[PDB]
Amino acid sequence: EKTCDLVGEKGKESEKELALLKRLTPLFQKSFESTVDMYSYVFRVCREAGQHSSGAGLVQIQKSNGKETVVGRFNETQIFQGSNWIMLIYKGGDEYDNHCGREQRRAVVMISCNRHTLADNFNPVSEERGKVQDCFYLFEMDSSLACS
Amino acid sequence: EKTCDLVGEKGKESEKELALLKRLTPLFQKSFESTVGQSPDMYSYVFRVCREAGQHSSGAGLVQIQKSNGKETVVGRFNETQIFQGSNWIMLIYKGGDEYDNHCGREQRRAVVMISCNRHTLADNFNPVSEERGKVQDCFYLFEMDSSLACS
Ligand SMILES: O=P(O)(O)OC[C@H]1O[C@@H](O)[C@@H](O)[C@@H](O)[C@@H]1O
Ligand SMILES: O=P(O)(O)OC[C@H]1O[C@@H](O)[C@@H](O)[C@@H](O)[C@@H]1O
Ligand SMILES: *[C@@H]1O[C@H](CO)[C@@H](O)[C@H](O)[C@H]1NC(C)=O
Ligand SMILES: *[C@@H]1O[C@H](CO)[C@@H](O)[C@H](O)[C@H]1NC(C)=O
Question: Which cysteines link up through disulfide bonds (chain B)?
Answer without folding.
Answer: 4-50, 104-139, 117-151
